Design a protein around this ligand. Structure first.
Ligand code: NI
Length: 283
C-alpha cells in the first residue's frame, strides 16, 4: 500500500475527465428535438457511465472529503447506478416529451401558416369571409392524428420498436402531474397507461368555429369585422394555451438537463481534486 503510481493515476483521471467533458458538451449543445438528437444524447450518457465504470477499476483512491461529496450528491459503483437511473428514467423521459411535442407543435404551425389563404374579402370594407370548413377540417385532422397511441403521440413512457410500452396508472399519473398536463392527457392502453399530447385547445378551437354558425353555400362564412375580431381573439387565446403548455415542457426539460449537469459538475470537480492530489507533494 506504500507503492505510489502517480503516472497511472494521472492518465486514468485525465481519461475520465475527458469522457465526462465530451458527454457534457453533447448534453449542453444538442437540443432534444428529434429522435436522432436524442439518440446522440443517450449515447453521451452511456459514454459517461462507461467512463466512471473504467475509473472505478483504475486504482485511483479518493479521500474522505471526496467520498463524502459523492455520497451526498448521488462508491464509484453507487454513483454510476444513480446517475444512470436519472439519465434513463428522468432526463430521458423529458427528452422524449420535447421531441414528441416539437413535431406535434410543428404540425399545428403548418396549419396556422394556411390561415391567410382562408380569409377572403367580404362584400364591403366592413365584412370578411372566413373559410371555416377548410380550417375546421385541418384542425380535426390534427386532432385525429394525435388522438391515437403510437410513437408520434406518446410522451411517457418513451417508445421504441413496434410494441407500446405502457406504465401503471400510478406511474403515469405521477408524470402527468410532473408535466402539468390536463387529465385528458392520461390514456389507458392495453395493460397500462400512457401520457399523450394535450389536444384540448385544438378541440376548443373547433367548437368555437362551429359556434360561429353554419357556413354559406361556398362552405365559407361571411362575418362583420367586429364578429371576426372577437373570433380571432378567442382563436389566439387557444393558440396561446398550446404555446404555454410547450413552454412549460421545454423549461421543465431544461431543468432536468440542469439537474443532470449539476451531478456531472460534481463528478468533474471530484476528478479535478484527485488530479491535484496526484500532481502535488508536501514540501
Ligand atoms: Ni505497499
Amino acid at each position: 500500500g506504500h507503492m505510489e503510481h502517480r503516472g497511472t493515476d494521472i492518465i486514468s483521471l485525465s481519461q475520465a475527465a475527458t469522457k465526462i467533458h465530451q458527454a457534457q458538451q453533447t448534453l449542453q449543445s444538442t437540443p432534444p428535438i428529434s429522435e436522432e438528437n436524442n439518440d446522440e444524447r443517450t449515447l453521451a450518457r452511456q459514454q459517461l457511465t462507461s467512463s466512471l465504470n473504467a475509473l472505478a477499476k483504475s486504482g485511483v483512491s479518493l479521500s474522505a472529503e471526496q467520498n463524502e461529496n459523492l455520497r451526498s450528491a448521488f462508491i464509484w459503483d453507487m454513483v454510476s447506478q444513480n446517475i444512470s437511473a436519472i439519465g434513463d428514467s428522468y432526463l430521458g423521459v423529458y427528452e422524449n416529451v420535447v421531441a414528441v411535442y416539437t413535431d406535434f407543435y410543428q404540425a399545428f404551425s403548418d396549419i396556422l401558416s394556411k390561415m391567410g389563404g382562408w380569409l377572403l374579402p367580404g362584400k364591403d370594407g366592413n365584412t370578411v369571409k372566413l373559410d371555416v370548413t377548410s380550417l375546421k377540417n385541418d384542425l380535426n385532422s390534427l386532432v385525429n392524428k394525435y388522438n391515437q397511441i403510437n410513437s408520434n403521440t406518446v410522451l411517457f413512457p418513451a417508445q421504441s420498436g413496434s410494441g407500446v410500452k405502457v406504465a401503471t396508472e400510478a406511474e403515469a399519473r405521477q408524470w402527468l402531474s410532473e408535466l402539468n398536463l390536463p387529465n385528458s392527457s392520461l390514456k389507458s392502453y392495453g395493460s397500462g397507461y400512457v401520457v399523450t399530447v394535450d389536444l384540448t385547445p385544438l378541440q376548443k378551437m373547433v367548437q368555437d368555429i362551429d359556434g360561429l354558425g353554419a357556413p354559406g353555400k361556398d362552405s365559407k362564412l361571411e362575418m362583420d369585422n367586429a364578429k371576426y375580431q372577437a373570433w380571432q381573439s378567442g382563436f389566439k387565446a387557444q393558440e396561446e394555451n398550446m404555446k404555454t403548455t410547450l413552454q412549460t415542457l421545454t423549461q421543465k426539460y431544461s431543468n432536468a438537463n440542469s439537474l443532470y449537469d449539476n451531478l456531472v459538475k460534481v463528478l468533474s470537480s471530484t476528478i479535478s481534486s484527485s488530479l491535484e492530489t496526484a500532481k502535488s507533494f508536501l514540501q
